[PDB]
């Protein structure tokens, strides 16, 4: 019992209520009381990570956190936490980092009180029964096994295990069956007693801070947490601290030639520095890496990109553990960027020398402070699951009075800090690392866990001393004042066209417009969305290639101007779709039109560089022949779309028709593509109703005057339909994966076209058998790590799907799914009315809520307008229909469309095999089957 607390700092645009205090045993608690919310959550972080795992067992925090969710003392059934949780519209998730471990859940309006008492029993006293252990070792093995051929994990563990082999930073965080099961029982160590020691003696009331997102008042939640979390015993465990680095100056100035499995080219430069975590008043590292990683006139990426060596650059602070931090600059390499390495790094030290000669600056610190000041004043509220574990994770580092303003405000300027951390960046402190396919065979070392092949060569003293010769600065200069920094912020008042859902305000043959002045959030922001429908973009794989190179080359030719607006919160996305081009500009309402019109009059009046076109063409040919290495659960999802859609071009045909792309060929494509096009748009949030008309009129005006765009006749606003499977029909499509040793599958039940009464049949049956599906496939049957079951909404046709990858043969694996459908056939009928009401309630809680972020209102209004459905009020009507369904109707839906002896049954399956009737070819399949209609617009 403690009585501490004061005014938690907030934004003046906030309405949430806060209270922080400690307990008598040492747990910190932050109390958030929000009466408007619809779900509720609580989370906590234990400051023990996987860095302090026992040496004999390679990873015990991860196996403990997998074994924690099973078998609380007070509630001893295995599935009990997630069965009380998923029936009340919540789904918990947790992870384990090097120095931390989070545990977060979410729950509905009122079941928080019956959810914390299942959640505190992970910390009071767990069982750790062995029968639920021999099952979980396999699940942690299948977690590891999908990351064995993943390059961002192979480079991570080669980054770790090349340094000091004595330092604990070089340990293995995950666990396979070898280190968890096979190594100990050979050596004779019991893992059960190691779990009991590691949870009882090392896992305590300190190194642990909780948070709760409730709807109850200030006073009724404080005593709630005191009542529930006072039983956690204290041990006064010292923090697992260590002030030294893993690099003791003999692991420096070396070059790591790394052989990848994906055809990539990268350059990793690494600088070790001490902690500046105490220095968050000035935050020197963000200053310095801001001046290093900048894309603008006269910058590092501009100079290296101008001579064709690099595609991208990222520079900043790669934090390690307490005691040490890294400083990295990472570039991408072209065909000739791979063999001009030391000249690249010579330019990097030339620019660092220019930052040394210019010294510190104060107006850059003032600008970076004002940008975070306005980025905190107008702050979008995050979802409850994920906002709690964030401020429970960073709660270990700051005082209670400043937690929300931790990384969003800055104190007075410290130049000597920036000068010292800049003086740490010296050529003798380098760690260059090269990743290239071209090193194959020439490598003579292997990583113990991931099998990565690396060769270590110390860099000669001639290049280190020529990097200390780096004073010929040339064309490198500091960035100028930004002009996308907003100064105007007012809300516009609600006009007399006060609509809750956006409506048409313009419908021509040329354009079509939807507009909702935002009434909920009152932020000076705006979403704009566009679609430029064109009948040429997906005619032939050559036209898909030329579309993608047009879009990518336009995005490359504009980043020089766009990156000064990305820092100020003006975010734009340009992408190619099977229908045409998608544009979407979002951010502050001040400088929307300048960026939008610059994008338009760079999209229409656009010429090509030959050197840049060749680099983008080779990069996209690489990104096309590179997809062959992908997880086996994703080739199946790729294949279902390939078979179901009317017409689709494979990766094999795109890369084969990419050979015939030339500059004269692409030069006349762009006026052909944008000759005749229909635009459909959405824009909402703090716009005048006429300013919507202006913002569409100047778009179609600029396009029609710079590109002579003519309207598109309405017989060509066609959209693709979906293949209609025959009743009582079973189809199988097999394929082989080459890179991964696992086998994937996706089962698909076609069901029928979307309707109010079909959508709720399918979603209520998907809500019945989701948590039993996870439980009885992954917890008991131990098939695999990835398992998923739900609806599939494509082309206005519904479906039920099963996506699981595993070590087993997929023809074996389908029969487990069918026996699951028999088991839940038996379970759904022998079932009570109360728990059926719970199941039909939690769907009426998940479907009926209100998103707090304005981009999610845009992401559902636009997400429905692009479906040509226009039913802006699906939630209310459809959930109203949901309240009338009975268990009899679900057995009608099952025994007719999903049972193994059902008349109307639509069954299609793919198989992705490991490296170590039937569908032969998809044109003779889609030729002989009929096609569904299209959905009627609301």
């Amino acid at each position: 019992i403690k009585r501490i607390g004061n005014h938690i700092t907030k934004s003046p645009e906030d309405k949430r209520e806060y209270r922080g205090l400690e307990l008598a045993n040492g747990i910190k608690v932050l109390l958030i009381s929000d009466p408007t919310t619809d779900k509720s959550s609580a989370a906590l972080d234990v400051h023990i990570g996987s860095l302090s795992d026992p040496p004999n067992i390679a990873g015990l925090s991860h196996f403990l956190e997998h074994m924690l969710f099973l078998g609380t003392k007070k509630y001893p059934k295995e599935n009990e936490y997630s069965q009380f949780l998923s029936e009340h519209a919540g789904s918990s998730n947790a992870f384990t980092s090097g120095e931390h471990t989070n545990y977060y859940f979410d729950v509905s309006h009122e079941h928080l009180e019956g959810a914390l008492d299942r959640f505190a029993q992970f910390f009071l006293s767990p069982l750790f029964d062995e029968s639920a252990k021999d099952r979980e070792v396999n699940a942690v093995d299948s977690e590891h096994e999908k990351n064995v051929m993943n390059d961002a994990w192979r480079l991570f563990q080669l980054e770790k295990a090349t340094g000091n082999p004595k330092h604990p930073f070089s340990k293995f965080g995950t666990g396979n069956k070898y280190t968890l099961e096979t190594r100990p029982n050979q050596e004779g160590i019991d893992v059960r007693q190691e779990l009991l020691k590691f949870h009882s003696a090392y896992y305590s009331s300190n190194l642990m801070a909780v948070v709760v997102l409730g709807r109850e008042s200030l006073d009724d939640l404080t005593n709630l947490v005191v009542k529930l979390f006072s039983e956690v015993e204290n041990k006064n465990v010292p923090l697992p601290e260590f002030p030294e680095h893993p690099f003791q100056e003999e692991h420096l100035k070396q070059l790591y030639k790394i052989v990848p499995i994906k055809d990539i080219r990268n350059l990793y430069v690494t600088f070790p520095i001490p902690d500046l975590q105490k220095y968050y008043k000035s935050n020197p590292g963000h200053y310095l890496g801001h001046l290093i990683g900048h894309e603008g006139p006269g910058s590092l990426l501009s100079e290296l990109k101008s001579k064709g060596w690099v595609n991208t650059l990222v520079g900043g602070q790669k934090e390690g553990a307490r005691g040490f931090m890294f400083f990295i600059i990472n570039v991408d390499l072209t065909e000739e960027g791979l063999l001009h390495v030391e000249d690249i790094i010579l330019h990097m030290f030339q620019y660092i020398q220019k930052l040394r000669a210019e010294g510190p600056q104060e107006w850059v610190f003032q600008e970076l402070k004002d940008l975070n000041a306005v980025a905190f004043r107008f702050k979008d509220k995050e979802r409850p699951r994920g906002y709690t574990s964030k401020i429970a994770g960073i709660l270990h580092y700051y005082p209670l009075e400043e937690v929300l303003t931790a990384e969003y405000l800055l104190e007075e300027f410290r130049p000597d800090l920036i000068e010292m951390v800049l003086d740490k960046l010296r050529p003798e402190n380098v760690r260059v690392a090269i990743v290239s396919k071209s090193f194959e065979g020439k490598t003579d070392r292997t990583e113990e866990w991931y099998g990565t092949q690396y060769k270590q060569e110390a860099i000669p003293d001639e290049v280190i001393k020529k990097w200390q010769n780096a004073d010929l600065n040339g064309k490198f200069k500091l960035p100028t004042k930004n002009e996308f920094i907003p100064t105007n912020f007012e809300i516009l008042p609600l006009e007399k066209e006060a609509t809750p859902y956006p409506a048409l305000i313009k419908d021509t043959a040329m354009s079509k417009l939807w507009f909702k002045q935002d009434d909920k959030f009152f932020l000076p922001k705006a979403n704009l969305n566009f679609e430029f429908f064109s009948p040429f973009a997906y005619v032939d794989p050559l036209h898909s290639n030329m579309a993608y190179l047009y879009l990518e080359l336009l995005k490359d030719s504009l980043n020089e101007y766009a990156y000064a607006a990305e820092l100020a919160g003006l975010s734009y996305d340009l992408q190619n779709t099977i229908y045409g081009m998608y544009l979407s500009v979002k951010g502050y309402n001040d400088k929307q039109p300048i960026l939008l019109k610059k994008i338009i009059e760079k999209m229409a009046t656009f010429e090509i560089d030959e050197k840049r076109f060749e680099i983008i063409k080779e990069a996209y040919m690489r990104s096309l022949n590179n997809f062959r290495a992908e997880q086996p659960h994703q080739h199946a999802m790729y294949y279902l779309r390939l078979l179901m859609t009317e017409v689709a071009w494979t990766k094999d045909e795109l890369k084969e028709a990419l050979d015939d792309v030339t500059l004269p060929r692409l030069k006349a494509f762009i006026p052909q593509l944008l000759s005749r096009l229909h635009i459909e748009a959405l824009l909402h949030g703090n716009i005048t109703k006429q300013a919507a008309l202006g913002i569409m009129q100047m778009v179609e005006d600029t396009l029609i005057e710079h590109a002579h765009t003519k309207p598109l006749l309405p017989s060509q606003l066609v959209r693709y339909r979906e293949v209609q499977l025959p009743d009582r029909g079973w189809f199988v499509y097999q394929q082989r994966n080459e890179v991964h040793n696992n086998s994937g599958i996706e089962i698909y039940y076609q069901t029928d076209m979307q309707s109010t009464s079909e959508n709720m049949f399918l979603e209520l049956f998907a809500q019945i058998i989701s948590e039993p599906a996870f439980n009885t496939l992954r917890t008991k049957e131990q098939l695999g790590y990835i398992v998923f079951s739900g609806p599939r909404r494509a082309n206005g046709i519904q479906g039920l799907r099963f996506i699981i990858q595993s070590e087993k043969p997929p023809h074996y694996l389908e029969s487990r799914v069918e026996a699951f459908l028999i088991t839940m056939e038996k379970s759904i009928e022998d079932m009570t009315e109360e728990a059926f009401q719970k199941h039909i309630q939690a769907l009426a809680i998940r479907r009926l809520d209100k998103p707090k972020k304005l981009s999610a209102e845009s992401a559902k209004y636009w997400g429905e307008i692009i479906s040509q459905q226009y039913n802006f009020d699906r939630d209310n009507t459809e959930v109203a229909y949901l309240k009338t369904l009975t268990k009899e109707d679900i057995i009608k839906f099952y025994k007719e469309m999903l049972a193994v002896d059902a008349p109307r049954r639509h069954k299609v399956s793919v198989h992705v095999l490991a490296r170590e009737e039937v569908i032969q070819n998809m044109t003779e399949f889609k030729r002989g089957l009929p096609l569904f209609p299209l959905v009627k617009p609301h």
Binding site: H286, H290, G293, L313, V314, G315, G316, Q317, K318
Partner: peptide, 5 residues
Amino acid sequence: FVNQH
């Protein structure tokens, strides 16, 4: 761009 840890 800045790494952002």
